[PDB]
Structure formats: C-alpha cells, structure tokens
C-alpha cells in the first residue's frame, strides 16, 4: 500500500543494490524508477506514489537481454521517459560476443501502465559514429528536444565525453553531435579519465547538466555544466564547466563514490530532489564493476543565494526530511 503525500520524507538507502537510479514523476500521481541491477542483465521497473514508497514497491522485470547478438551483453542504466503520449526507455547495451561493446537502444510502450504494458524494441539509437556509447538522456526546451549522452571519441584519451545534439523524434538525432565536456581536471581522472551519466535540471533561467567522473569506486564524484537557457545549446562555448567537483565522497557521513544521479521533484513540483547512488564503505574487494553495493538514495537540491545549485554532501544513512510544504 503506497498512500500519497505532499511531504517528502525518506529513509536512506531507499533501494539497496540498485545503481544508476532514474526517477521520473509522471502526471498520474506516480514516481517511476529504473536502474542498473547488479547482474547487468535486465531492465526492472517499479512505481510508487511517494519517493520513500519506492523502497517497498514491487519491481517488475520488463525486459531481459537477448540470448545472442545485439542487446545480448551488459545492460546498463535505463531511463524511462514519457514523450508525446508514449513511454520510452533509453538504455545502453553490449553484445553477446562483446558484453562491453556498448551502444544506445530504445524501447517503447503505448499502454498507459508501463509495468503491465507491452514493450517493443526500437533498435539502436545511432550517433555520428560507432563507438562506446552509453548513458543517453533526453530533455526538451523551447520546443526543441535534445539528446545528451556519453561516448568514446577514438581521437581523445578518455573513456567517454559528454555530447549534445538536436533530436528528430524520440528515436533519432539530427545534425552533428557537439562535445560539451571532456576530462580535464585531476578529479575527473582518478582511476580512469571519464565523463558519463549526464543528467539535466532546468531552473532559474539556466540549464544545468551534472555528470559523473573518475572510476566507479570511492573516487566517483560529480561535476557541473551550466548554460543560459537562451543560449545556443549546440555551441560548446555556451557551456561553462565548474572547476571543482560539485559532489563527492564524505567520510564523516560514511558515503563513498556518489554519482550517476537523476533529478525529480516533490509531488507539488516545488522542490528539486537529486536521486543518486553511493556505497556506505570505502574499500572494495575484486573489480569495482561487480561490487553490487551502490545503493539508491535521495536528498534535496539546495539553491545558493545567486541561483546556482548547492548539492552539499551526501547525507548520512537514516531518516531525511526533504520537504514539508509551508
Ligand atoms: O553507466 C555505464 C557504467 O555502468 C554503470 O553500471 C555505471 O553507472 C557506469 O560506470
């Protein structure tokens, strides 16, 4: 039983053993959540009227990797969107012969309930060139839809960079893709040099895009890109990268390697809430890729006096009062 509520009060972790949390608040009174499962082998979906309710909602496996061929490798970081009356899931997948040969793919469901509904594959979402491609998100602004994602440029020594492009329908991009972020500070390079997990927040006349950098261990952290929402978002000079991490490990709250966030709101739409993953310990045994204990958690997004986002530090486990309406 998930009863609705206008206050947002959560117990972290909200969902254990789920990395890359994506939470979308729909017009039907429900939060929808997708994420990476530790086996990297399926797409699970759950819904709840409240954020905290996600801890007890029954998850459904809606899609499983192919026995062989494309979409037969790793299954990473799906995001469920609602666009033009239809559900879409953007996710990254490798092949059976190379689990790590990752491209973008899209699913679509026309039924109103996406848990019970019928899901249909729509194939790969190609970009300007074939390479390591992952973590596509989409947003709309001033009547134009965009794709923001991470991709390997063979001419650049980084696992991936952040790209933007205009879209032509929810299933394709158009034009040239534009690089708006590449690893350049040392905090983007501990372990491996990486920018990935772009996430879009629109507020205060600006478009904010957080991203994650460094390896997926305790060194994982987040940086910020900002642009004015009246600029040319395909112009790389529209995007300013904050020089320092905007979110990182905090040993005093016991939260390590936080990142790959998404953004949602309270039910009334008035506060912004960041949903992300972190571990509650520092040292990892084996390859960090198969440590399954990145846990999904949430905390409020605060706002500086000047209107830039204040992400603060990962809150300690336990209860967290995010929002009580005045
Ligand atoms: O998103 C692609 C990679 O695999 C995921 O599980 C992680 O979030 C990231 O490093």
Numbering used by the authors: 149 to 474
Question: Please, what does the article write about this entry?
Answer:
To determine the biochemical properties of AtAbf43C, recombinant AtAbf43C (Residues 21–511, lacking the signal peptide and dockerin I domain) and truncation mutants AtAbf43C_CBM42 (Residues 21–167) and AtAbf43C_GH43 (Residues 167–494) were expressed and purified. At the optimal pH and temperature, AtAbf43C and AtAbf43C_GH43 had specific activities of 4.95 ± 0.28 U/mg and 5.67 ± 0.63 U/mg, respectively, on pNPAra, while AtAbf43C_CBM42 showed no activity on pNPAra, with U defined as mM/s of released pNP. This confirmed that AtAbf43C_GH43 contained the active catalytic domain. The catalytic GH43 domain displays the five-bladed β-propeller fold typical of GH43 enzymes. The GH43 domain of AtAbf43C does not have a C-terminal β-jelly roll domain found in some subfamilies of GH43 proteins; however, the N-terminal strand of the domain appears to form part of the fifth blade in the blade V structure in what is colloquially termed a ‘molecular velcro’. This closure in the structure, thought to provide extra structural stability, is not found in many GH43 enzymes in which the fifth blade in the beta propeller only consists of residues found in the C-terminal strand. In AtAbf43C, these residues were identified to be D168, D283, and E344, found closely grouped at the base of the beta propeller structure. The topology of this binding pocket, characteristic of exo-acting GH43 enzymes, is such that the three catalytic residues are positioned at the bottom of a deep, narrow opening that sterically limits access to larger or branched substrates. When overlaid with the apo structure of the AtAbf43C GH43 domain, the bound arabinose and arabinobiose from SaAraf43A fit neatly within the surface structure of the AtAbf43C-binding pocket, suggesting AtAbf43C maybe be active on similar AOS substrates as SaAraf43A.
